Design a protein around this ligand. Structure first.
Ligand code: HEM
Ligand SMILES: N[C@@H](CC(=O)c1ccccc1NC=O)C(=O)O
Ligand SMILES: N[C@@H](Cc1c[nH]c2ccccc12)C(=O)O
Ligand code: NA
Length: 386
């Protein structure tokens, strides 16, 4: 299911170079802060020729070309972010991008698996995966804090990954009726979620709230339910009608959904605004990760095993996992308040009164409120406690 032992849902050692044939793409993607600032980005994109994708012959090269083209697409549509949008993606970019995306079974828009899971490198290959040994491959604007946002996102992803390798033992232990093994495995998983919560605290010293809200969030914004692009984006020369696709969210992270499905927590079931959003977000995940979540759903319920047992220790190990998931979502609520809500009331993007966000200048849907969505997801988690 293309899950790594060290990095989990992340692409191990992403490719950094494309074949020389695609150098013109690489040059524009590496120079977006320059080309955007100078108002030359759009002109440069419109002057490219069409480059066949036929010389992208391995998965890692295709993932890199998809990160490159996705970054160029965000920059082209939004420009400087001052509201001067482009509603048609030119043929010479749009056609090879939609072909590539169909080969990778991903939508033709920048997603989490591009801008986080494939957008990193080690500075020192021989030194471990820590922030100060790492760097991102692409940024949009000078001072947009893309390095902090993408890399701390990744590191949280890597920390949660250490739980995914226990999930085999969880299911083996149930069928072997292995009480002590099952109980210890659940403690291990909770410990790994506790560690991802620790890593998530690093956001504050690498991402500035106002740069995120006022710069980086622009290029992470899609064209689903976006007043700037009511009917979607036109992929010239590929589809005749505009299409609507949500922007990046870690809604597109398997991580929280992986543990929702493992623990028998039903976000995924019986819900209006929520649940449906979580399931559509699976369309923005790499196919192998989509399948991993669906195989998980087909296993016996860990939760119902644990209720049937009359075992206070087993029940406590399970609750430790649910509790860690709750804390992660409580903490993620605070983050969203600092990085989206508070800036959006200080008048760089207006909602209602001060904190009635459609989530604002963003990407997929806000319905009424993203905090209502996020609170609903968290509240369902805490009602799963035994
Ligand atoms: C750092 C690692 C992060 C992870 C692992 C993560 C994970 C998630 C997940 C799994 C969801 C889906 C809801 C849920 O399952 O509870 C979500 C939603 C959301 N996240 Fe995050 N998140 C991270 C960072 C951030 C940051 C820094 C922001 C800054 C505002 C943010 C903004 C949002 C928003 C606005 C939503 C609501 C869905 C949407 O409208 O996009 N996330 N996140
Ligand atoms: N930032 C939050 C929570 C927090 O900082 C925290 C610190 C250590 C271990 C866990 C935490 N989050 C628990 O939900 C606070 O202000 O308390
Ligand atoms: N979801 C927030 C920011 C965010 C959180 N996780 C993400 C992953 C990818 C891209 C953006 C995000 C937004 O609407 O912009
Ligand atoms: Na582990």
């Amino acid at each position: 299911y293309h899950i790594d032992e060290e990095v989990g849902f992340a692409l191990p050692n992403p490719q950094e170079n494309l074949p020389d044939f695609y150098n013109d793409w690489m040059f524009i993607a590496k120079h977006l802060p320059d080309l955007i600032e100078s108002g030359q980005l759009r002109e440069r994109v419109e002057k490219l020729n069409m480059l066949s994708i036929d010389h992208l012959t391995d998965h890692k090269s295709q993932r890199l070309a998809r990160l490159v083209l996705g970054c160029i697409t965000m920059a082209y549509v939004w420009g400087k972010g001052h509201g001067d949008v482009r509603k048609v993606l030119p043929r010479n970019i749009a056609v090879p991008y939609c072909q590539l995306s169909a080969a990778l079974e991903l939508p033709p828009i920048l997603v989490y698996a591009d801008c986080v899971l494939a957008n990193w490198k080690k500075k020192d290959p021989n030194k471990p995966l820590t922030y100060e040994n790492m760097d991102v491959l692409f940024s949009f604007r000078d001072g947009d804090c893309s390095k902090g946002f993408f890399l701390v996102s990744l590191l949280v992803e890597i920390a949660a990954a250490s739980a995914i390798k226990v999930i085999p033992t969880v299911f083996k232990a149930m069928q072997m009726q292995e009480r002590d093994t099952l109980l210890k495995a659940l403690l291990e998983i909770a410990s790994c979620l506790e560690k991802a919560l620790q890593v998530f605290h690093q956001i504050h010293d690498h991402v500035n709230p106002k740069a995120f809200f006022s710069v980086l969030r622009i290029y992470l914004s899609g064209w689903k339910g976006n007043p700037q692009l009511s009917d979607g984006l036109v992929y010239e020369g590929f589809w005749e009608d505009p299409k609507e696709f949500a922007g990046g969210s870690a809604g597109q992270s398997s991580v929280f959904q992986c543990f929702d499905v493992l623990l028998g927590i039903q976000q995924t079931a019986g819900g209006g605004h929520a649940a449906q959003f979580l399931q559509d977000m699976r369309r923005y995940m790499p196919p192998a990760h989509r399948n991993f979540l669906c195989s998980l759903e087909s296993n016996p319920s860990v939760r119902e095993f644990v209720l049937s047992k009359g075992d206070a220790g087993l029940r406590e190990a399970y609750d430790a996992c649910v509790k860690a998931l709750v804390s992660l979502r409580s903490y993620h609520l605070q983050i969203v308040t600092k990085y989206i809500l508070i800036p959006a009331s200080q008048q760089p993007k207006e909602n209602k009164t001060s904190e009635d966000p459609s989530k604002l200048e963003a990407k997929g849907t806000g319905g009424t409120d993203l905090m209502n969505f996020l609170k609903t997801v968290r509240s369902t988690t805490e009602k799963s406690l035994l």
